[PDB]
């Protein structure tokens, strides 16, 4: 509705970026962990099932 004004906000809105930028910097290396744990599940799945079906 409003274009942000003309003073004050430079510092605040820059620290918008500081928060955001650092937040989203790191949110990835938040997420890197979960991608690791996906692998743990990935190996394990069909193993015996396929085996003991067959006899």
């Amino acid at each position: 509705s409003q274009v942000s004004p003309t003073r004050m906000n430079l510092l605040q809105r820059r620290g918008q970026l500081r928060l955001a930028q650092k937040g989203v910097d790191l949110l990835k290396k938040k997420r890197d962990a979960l991608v690791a744990e996906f692998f743990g599940l990935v190996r394990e799945a069909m193993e015996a099932r396929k085996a003991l079906d067959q006899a």
């Binding site: 996906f38 990935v42 799945a45 069909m46 396929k50 079906d53 067959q54």
Partner: protein
């Protein structure tokens, strides 16, 4: 809880538990899908490769956010099944997550 495959093979199921049903009476299985959810005490439903465990949208159209059995892969009967095993794993990873 419940599963389906051909009657002729189904019997085995029918022994210990697996109060299964036919699977050649529909090549849509939607019929069964709903019927299954009538009681809903079956948290497990799985199907052969006769259908395909890829058009789950039936379930999505019915459960509609009320997670109820993920259709699981069976395969009609082994005759080889291990070829597309290491495959079924790889087929998944590329289109999920990232492509390699």
């Amino acid at each position: 809880m419940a599963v389906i495959a051909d009657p002729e093979t189904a019997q085995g199921f029918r022994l210990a538990g697996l109060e299964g049903y036919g699977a050649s009476s529909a090549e849509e299985a939607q019929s069964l899908l709903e019927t299954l959810v009538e009681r809903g005490g079956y948290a497990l439903v799985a199907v052969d490769e006769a259908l395909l465990p890829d058009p789950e949208r039936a379930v999505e159209r019915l459960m509609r956010g009320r997670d109820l059995p993920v259709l699981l892969p069976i395969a009609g009967l082994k005759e080889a099944f291990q070829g597309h095993d290491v495959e079924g794993y790889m087929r998944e990873l590329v289109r999920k997550t990232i492509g390699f």
